[PDB]
Ligand binder design. Structure first.
Ligand SMILES: [Ca+2]
Length: 223
């Protein structure tokens, strides 16, 4: 997260860290047994880390649970990032409490202007590299279709939206990948891509979760 702020321990209780010996992506807890992330975060050997603040210190509220199954979207295209969403099932159910909680799925696609919270342990620099140990947060509005599509001609599909600031300075970044964009108490987006980070006229691009609700629900219910 570039130009954001320190969230505060466990203030984003649906935020997860995906770990394969190190943090490599975020995700969101959608029920006690399931995490949603980006398809581009796929790998084998994922451990899901819940109740994290500092990812380098065991602070006492964490749950570490191995994945039993990954399901990349049937139509994920790694070349275009279309359908950049994946489901991860936990080997055992997470214990739900104040610091580990699920986030609701959206019931419609949010409008331009809606304010959202984006969070993660990604790069905090727009030039260079600095990875934070504690969770960072950013408040950012959904941008209009035309703002998004003008910034990235030919590359935005009906399954992507933009959120952030066209002036630059404030954005998600590498390492935030797969993490939540939450607007009005719903999971509207998944951190997907962008051109650099916090660059002028290059806002973040996010998987439009509202398009996937049916697939998520059907897939979880059969697995
Ligand atoms: Ca920790």
């Amino acid at each position: 997260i570039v130009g954001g702020y320190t969230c505060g321990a466990n203030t984003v209780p649906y935020q997860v860290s995906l770990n394969s010996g190190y943090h490599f992506c975020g995700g969101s807890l959608i029920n006690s047994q399931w995490v949603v992330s980006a398809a581009h975060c796929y790998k084998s050997g994922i451990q899901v880390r819940l109740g994290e603040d500092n990812i380098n210190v065991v602070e006492g509220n964490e749950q570490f649970i191995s994945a039993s199954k990954s399901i990349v979207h049937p139509s994920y295209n790694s070349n275009t990032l279309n359908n950049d969403i994946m489901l991860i099932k936990l080997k055992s159910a997470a214990s739900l409490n104040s610091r580990v909680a699920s986030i609701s799925l959206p019931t419609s696609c949010a409008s331009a202007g809606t304010q959202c919270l984006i969070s993660g342990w990604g790069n905090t620099k727009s030039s260079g590299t600095s990875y934070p140990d504690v969770l960072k947060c950013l408040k950012a509005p959904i941008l209009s279709d035309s703002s998004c599509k003008s910034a990235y001609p030919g590359q935005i599909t009906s399954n992507m939206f933009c959120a952030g600031y066209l002036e630059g300075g404030k954005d998600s970044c590498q390492g935030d990948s797969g993490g939540p964009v939450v607007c009005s108490g719903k999971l509207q987006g998944i951190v997907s891509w962008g051109s650099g980070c916090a660059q002028k006229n290059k806002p973040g691009v996010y998987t439009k979760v509202c398009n996937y609700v049916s697939w998520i629900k059907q897939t979880i219910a059969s697995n």
